[PDB]
């Protein structure tokens, strides 16, 4: 009767495809065909943050748009002052194999994780000025690929064990697990309202999740390979995904479809990081060919290139005020652009 | 007039960078190793064992609680001194799976500069099975000859050495299909009880660092 269930699944996905095509009235290219191009976006390196010994895997801005956290495989978390280029904190980690890091929206905690399968939370504001390990969230059976704070007490974690988890930090327990992906999850992205997050995995699929209900609302396909990066559009009704198929794609929740493809014939490397500008007009994508491209999210045109890294671009972040973009690389350097 | 906060931030920066210079000195003296297999008492998500040979520090990492899909977390080990690849020389075709995995690690665009120390183990069982099966998996064996540049160890028939060297050649075919000088395969022979394995790893790491230094010191 497994064949019966496979038949039912194939007919259901055919129904889903027909319902999706019934909504594809006009391509985004046809609706933004008369809007003005953005021209040539030329950005300059304003800061080069040195101090890391090994390759940088993660980088998160603070909500103050001034402080940064970066994770390198030497085993250090550095908290940067982007304006003065100074180092505020350097946190040695128990495991040097950190793959992700996350700055808390309050500014009081910082999380990291990696091949230890543990989300370590660090207190940044202690009465003696010491940075301590507040909590070690264990329970994932695979590596920890992305961390994102909901508030000071809740964090969302993606894993190589194909599951995402919502943690209660004070209790150190796993409140809800999000199953449904088939490959290891690579990146998460929270919505601006913190009620929905989107997940990107190594099965060419992206899933929308209800943080409270614990269920998968929508599943988005269209990529040919593993999705390495995902980011919500500022409105919260769309998101961009970058894959190892040398392509970034704009999806829309309310249409349940893909709206735009960001690809060029001479780009044959995977996308490692994507981020939107404050307006959502630009789409900064980090690539394996050592530089970042700036896309016109509405016209699928390439508006600029951020060259200046001599190894793989791993990290890419835009400040909440939209003032500057930060890039991390395997050459062990953080650069800030404007 | 808050120059106080600025000078305090610069003093904190000075302390941080002093600690960074010292831990940089400690980082450059430690040699990372990845233990990929098909040893724990030789001498969570990842286990770490520290050794010491001739006052040199080595940190070996074997992957623990990870799923068998490796293509994403194997990019973290692109800066290690060497990947130690342990093969049980020989109910599935585990030797061909080993060859496939070695080919994937060898031709990965991120491990393109990472040398591999190959350990072909389980040679007691290999011997007693050769005398008594491998030619049910490799047809070129029944028409293969032991090379002349091979060690004549005392006591063992040409049959077991033929099997050993055929498997070593199966790996060296992958290793030399590239032909570019960027990373090397050091094939070794392991037994059930050995002591020179750490010496072999140390010598191969000395060789890898020396080649890197020839490249770095504009001597190549």
């Amino acid at each position, epitope marked *: 009767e497994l064949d019966q269930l*496979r038949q039912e699944a194939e007919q259901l*996905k055919n129904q889903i495809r027909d319902a999706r095509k019934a909504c594809a009235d006009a391509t985004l290219s046809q609706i933004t065909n008369n809007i003005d191009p953005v021209g040539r976006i030329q950005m300059r390196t304003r800061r080069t943050l040195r101090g890391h010994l090994a390759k940088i895997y993660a980088m998160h801005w603070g909500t103050d748009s001034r402080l940064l956290v970066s994770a390198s495989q030497d085993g250090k978390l550095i908290i940067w002052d982007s304006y003065t280029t100074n180092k505020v904190h350097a946190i040695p980690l128990r495991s040097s194999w950190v793959m992700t890091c996350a700055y808390a929206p309050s500014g009081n905690y910082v999380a990291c994780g990696g091949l230890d399968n543990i989300c370590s939370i660090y207190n940044l504001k202690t009465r003696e000025g010491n940075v301590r390990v507040s909590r070690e969230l264990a329970g994932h059976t695979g590596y920890l690929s992305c961390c994102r704070f909901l508030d000071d007490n809740q964090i969302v974690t993606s894993s190589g064990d*194909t599951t995402c988890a919502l943690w209660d930090i004070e209790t150190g327990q796993q409140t809800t697990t999000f199953t449904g992906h*088939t*490959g290891d999850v690579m990146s998460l992205s929270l919505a601006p309202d913190t009620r929905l997050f989107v997940s990107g995995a*190594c*099965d*060419a699929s992206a899933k929308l999740w209800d943080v409270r209900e614990g269920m998968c609302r929508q599943t988005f*396909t*269209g990529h*040919e*390979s*593993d999705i390495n990066a995902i980011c919500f559009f500022p409105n919260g009704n769309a998101f961009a995904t970058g894959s*190892d*198929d*040398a392509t970034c794609r704009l999806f829309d929740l309310r249409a349940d479809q893909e709206l735009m493809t960001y690809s060029h014939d001479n780009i*044959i490397c*995977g996308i490692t990081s994507v981020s939107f500008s404050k307006s959502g007009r630009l789409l900064l994508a980090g690539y394996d060919d050592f530089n970042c491209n700036v896309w016109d999210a509405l016209k699928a045109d390439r508006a600029g290139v951020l060259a200046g890294h001599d190894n793989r671009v791993s990290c890419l972040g835009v400040t909440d005020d939209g003032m500057a973009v930060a890039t991390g690389s395997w050459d062990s350097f953080l650069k800030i652009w404007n | 007039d808050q120059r106080n906060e600025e000078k305090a931030q610069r003093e904190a920066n000075k302390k941080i960078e002093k600690q960074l210079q010292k831990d940089k000195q400690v980082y450059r003296a430690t040699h990372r190793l990845l233990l990929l297999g098909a040893i724990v008492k030789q001498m969570s998500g990842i286990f770490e064992t520290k050794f010491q040979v001739d006052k040199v520090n080595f940190h070996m990492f074997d992957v623990g609680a990870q*799923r*068998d*899909e*490796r*293509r994403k977390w194997i990019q973290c080990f692109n800066d290690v001194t060497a990947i130690i690849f342990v093969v049980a020389s020989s*109910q*599935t*075709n585990r030797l*061909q*799976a080993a060859l*496939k*995995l070695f*080919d*994937s*690690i*060898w*031709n*990965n*665009k991120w491990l393109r500069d990472t040398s591999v120390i190959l350990f072909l183990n389980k040679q007691d069982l290999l011997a007693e099975k050769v005398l008594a099966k491998i030619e*049910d*998996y*490799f*047809p*070129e064996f029944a028409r293969y000859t032991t090379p002349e540049d091979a060690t004549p160890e005392p006591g063992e028939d040409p049959r077991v050495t033929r099997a050993k060297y055929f498997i070593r050649d199966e790996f060296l075919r992958i290793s030399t299909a590239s032909g570019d000088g960027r990373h090397y395969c050091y094939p070794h022979f392991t037994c059930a009880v050995d002591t020179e394995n750490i010496r072999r790893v140390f010598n191969d790491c000395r060789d890898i660092i020396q080649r890197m230094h020839l490249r770095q010191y504009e001597l190549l």
Partner: nanobody, 126 residues
Framework: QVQLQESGGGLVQPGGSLRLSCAAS????????MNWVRQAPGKGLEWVSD????????SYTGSVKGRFTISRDNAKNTLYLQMNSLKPEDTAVYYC?????????????????????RGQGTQVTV
């Protein structure tokens, strides 16, 4: 959506021949290396064959050399496995595995766990 449909299996006399076919959709077929992976009744997944993006580099596992042959038609998005002189050792489920990323020379796709870019397979019985 990446799909790989395998067809052509069935029951064959010891010594006969088959032709498995793999219909691909949802990706640029000519950009990826394709494979054939096997799963015997009580054993794990074993690799069988491997063809390059163009069809020039071809490799087989040793137990099937001379007997099996692999080909691809990039114009029709299809992969073929012509099997000759079948033995009862060849009784298994034959999957069509695509390598994870395009324009590469490495693949990690024989995982007993769920590998994503692999069809549901066809059964060959001898």
């Amino acid at each position: 959506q990446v799909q790989l449909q395998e067809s052509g299996g069935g029951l064959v006399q010891p010594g006969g021949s088959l032709r498995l076919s793999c219909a691909a959709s949802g990706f640029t077929f000519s950009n990826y290396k394709m494979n054939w992976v096997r799963q015997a009744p009580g054993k794990g997944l074993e690799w069988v064959s491997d063809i390059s993006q163009s069809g020039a580099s071809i490799s087989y596992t040793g137990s099937v050399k001379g007997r099996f042959t692999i080909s691809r038609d990039n114009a029709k998005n299809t992969l073929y496995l012509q099997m000759n002189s079948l033995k009862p050792e060849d009784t298994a489920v034959y999957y069509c595995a695509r390598c994870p990323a395009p324009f590469t020379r490495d693949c990690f796709d024989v995982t007993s766990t769920t590998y994503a870019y692999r069809g549901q397979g066809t059964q060959v019985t001898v």
